């Protein structure tokens, strides 16, 4: 997998060497094709996964993501052509390159055989992200948000560093292939009960768990649209990908060491879903929607039943695409409105007829409408959770009712009701804004036709 | 909706606004017109008497026991008109009342058709900018000595001037689009 | 009460302007300057469907399954040739 990567690196030379006026089209057009080369990995045609070479591999779980990581770079660069079009021609070429490095790094992290290669690349992605959030962040508080995003991930990260070096000494190689075909069975000691927490905690932090998710609402609030898309679509899912590949070892402990997180997540799912119900900042509500719909995932990567896992793989890819779509349209309202407040800007369909159709489809993806991969995902996690304990439906049942309420409230108070009297007149929709959306949903429609590709390792 | 709300309400407007709620809440209980036109001229009688009470205290003691008699003898589902707040068509057609400052972002192609329409629209926009100065100045030169201030706005008071702040009472999206 | 003599002129005048706005809203002649089939969508769709149902579904296994046909006493079975025995006589 060096075509999904080397051609990517070369994007950096192109963003720099290219003309200031033509820099945007060379980069966006080329990474669209970079995504097309990424599609070749989908050609499995056999059970044996694809070990491209010693360090680089792609199995069913990584492949559905590498393609998404390559896909969003085009979109990210199309959603940030407006803001970041007021810059000095060298601030742009820095932002474009920063976005380019994220997927170079993220493509490799999702396509990495050695778990510590994951760690080095895993924690590197913070550098590009923190720059995108802090350097271009509009609000006074991004310095703070950046600190929260760096420390919560970093304090979790050093325990994983110690744990992975620890298993290398215990087993003798951090190669995901071998670690899988070798006998690593923890022994339920008090210490192992700590190892397990060391490995999972760093992944559980960037996958916002109810206890440590305050970093994500603060980060996406002041982050520029491209950073918020990256955090929701690819960055948070780095934590999920890690939990799937790391729990191959630590096989016995999670049977009983998971209860704490599972309950934290399911109760967390309800409270995070509910506070979405009365949050005035739209970007705030989407972020907590992201916490709740990701709290379902940590509760399926821990129950560990075949269906959970691919419920997880289905939902992660699906929610990634949906969340960005929501964060992208939130930005289009923010740029014309100039405020994140949900109460202002009422009645837009009256003035932006189509964006509202995109808003409606994004919300229906947000809630579980049935001919969507989003529902298949939740339906499956719901099933397994029920298997874990029939009572789980109650808590995963209060979340579904709340999820319907906030998803439609975003449509009802942003895209319906009487028009706002006279905010700065709202200029019509650009074709870029609409495509950036179409590019998010057309793939959501196509993937829903053949869900098999994003089903995970389990199935 | 047009005129501005008075600060405090008088005795009269409180009495005379019960005569409306009352009679109108008597046409829900008494639906047939005859029964109504009967049971209602009997209502006026109630208000007709106790009309000349000069004893304010008393008057405000007949009013406060009238509006409690009424609250307990009101209809749960009265007859509220179709297009009035609380009605059945209230704000129905508002999905078609776009705010008119939106025809300014139309593509030169769209505005190409509908040609004379925009020829008259550009006249009115000239009227609006041609008076903002004389208007705001009027609004200010006539700021009565600081004190009570009500939301009532002044008329023109000079030829050529246009009533101050007139761009959104005129140019208001048509009711039924 | 009664309108204040200075509010029956701000409604006097502004109504006069609203009347002109609504006149201006009126479209001039020409204003809008612009610059059997039944079988069609019943038969054409049908051929396709049939093509699909008689050459994919029918062909694939267990794609169009049907409750057994009903066979009563005394009625013949076309495929095998058997004649269902007549039932025991109803005495009453």
């Amino acid at each position: 997998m060096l075509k999904i990567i080397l051609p990517s690196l070369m994007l950096l030379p192109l963003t720099w060497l290219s003309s200031p006026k033509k820099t945007w089209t060379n980069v966006t057009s080329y990474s669209f094709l970079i995504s097309l080369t990424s599609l070749t990995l989908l050609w499995q045609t056999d059970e044996n996964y694809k070990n491209f070479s010693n360090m680089f591999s792609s199995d069913p779980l990584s492949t559905p993501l590498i393609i998404l990581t390559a896909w969003l770079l085009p979109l990210m660069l199309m959603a940030s052509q407006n803001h970041l079009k007021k810059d000095n021609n060298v601030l742009q070429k820095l932002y474009i390159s920063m976005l380019i490095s994220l997927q170079i790094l993220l493509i490799m992290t999702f396509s990495a055989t050695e778990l510590i290669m994951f760690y080095i690349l895993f924690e590197a992605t913070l550098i590009p992200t923190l720059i995108i959030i802090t350097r271009w962040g509009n609000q006074t508080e991004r310095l703070n948000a950046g600190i929260y995003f760096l420390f919560y991930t970093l304090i979790g990260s050093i325990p994983l560093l110690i744990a992975l070096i620890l298993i290398q000494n215990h087993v003798g190689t951090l190669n995901l292939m071998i670690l899988s075909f070798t006998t690593h069975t923890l022994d339920a000691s008090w210490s192992n009960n700590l190892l397990w927490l060391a490995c999972m905690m760093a992944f559980l932090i960037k996958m916002p768990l109810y206890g440590v998710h305050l970093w994500l609402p603060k980060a996406h609030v002041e982050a520029p649209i491209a950073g918020s898309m990256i955090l929701a679509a690819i960055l948070l899912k780095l934590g999920s990908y890690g939990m799937i590949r790391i729990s191959i070892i630590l096989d016995p402990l999670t049977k009983y060491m998971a209860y704490p997180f599972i309950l934290l997540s399911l109760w967390g799912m309800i409270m995070t879903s509910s506070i979405c119900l009365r949050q005035t900042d739209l970007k705030s509500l989407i972020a907590y929607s992201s916490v709740s719909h990701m709290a379902l995932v940590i509760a399926s990567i821990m129950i560990q039943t075949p269906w959970s896992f691919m419920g997880a793989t289905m939902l992660m890819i699906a929610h990634g695409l949906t969340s960005s779509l929501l964060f992208c349209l939130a930005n289009s309202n923010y740029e014309r409105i100039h405020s994140r407040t949900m109460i202002m800007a009422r009645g837009l369909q009256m003035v932006f007829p189509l964006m509202a159709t995109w808003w409606l489809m994004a919300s229906l993806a947000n809630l579980a409408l049935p001919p969507s991969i989003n529902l298949m995902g939740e339906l499956f996690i719901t099933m397994s959770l029920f298997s874990w304990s029939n009572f789980t439906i109650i808590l995963m049942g209060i979340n579904i009712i709340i999820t319907g309420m906030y998803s439609m409230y975003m449509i009802i108070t942003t895209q319906r009701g009487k028009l706002t009297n006279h905010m700065i007149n709202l200029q019509p929709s650009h074709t870029r804004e609409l495509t950036l959306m179409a590019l998010h949903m057309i793939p959501l429609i196509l993937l829903t036709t053949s869900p098999k590709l994003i089903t995970g390792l389990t199935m | 909706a047009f005129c501005a709300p008075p600060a405090y309400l008088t005795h009269q407007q409180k009495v005379l606004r019960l005569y409306k709620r009352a009679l109108r809440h008597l046409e829900s209980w008494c639906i047939h017109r005859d029964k109504y036109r009967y049971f209602a001229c009997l209502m006026r009688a109630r208000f007709e008497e106790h009309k000349n009470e000069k004893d304010m205290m008393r008057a405000t003691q007949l009013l406060r026991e009238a509006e409690e008699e009424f609250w307990q003898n009101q209809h749960p589902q009265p007859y509220i008109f179709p297009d009035s707040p609380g009605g059945t068509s209230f704000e129905r057609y508002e999905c078609y009342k776009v705010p008119e400052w939106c025809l300014d972002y139309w593509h030169p192609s769209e505005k190409a058709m509908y040609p004379d329409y925009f020829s008259k629209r550009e006249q009115w926009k000239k009227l609006r900018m041609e008076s903002w100065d004389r208007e705001v100045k009027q609004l200010q030169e006539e700021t009565s000595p600081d004190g009570i201030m009500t939301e009532a706005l002044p008329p023109a008071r000079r030829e050529g001037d246009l009533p101050p702040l007139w761009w959104h009472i005129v140019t208001r999206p048509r009711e039924r689009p | 009460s009664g309108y204040t003599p200075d509010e029956k002129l701000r409604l006097q005048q502004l109504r006069e302007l609203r009347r002109r706005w609504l006149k201006d809203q009126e479209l001039s002649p020409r204003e809008p300057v612009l610059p059997l089939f039944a079988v069609s969508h019943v038969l054409i769709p049908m051929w396709f469907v049939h093509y699909y149902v008689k050459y994919h579904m029918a062909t694939k296994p267990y794609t169009i399954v049907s409750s057994k046909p009903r066979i009563f006493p005394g009625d013949t079975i076309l495929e095998t040739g058997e004649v269902i025995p007549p039932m025991r006589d109803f005495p009453d």
């Binding site: 007829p353 019509p428 074709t431 | 593509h107 | 609504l22 204003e31």
Partner: peptide
Amino acid sequence: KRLFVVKPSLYY
């Protein structure tokens, strides 16, 4: 008396 019906710009 056909009347002009204001509408959001619908070309974009």
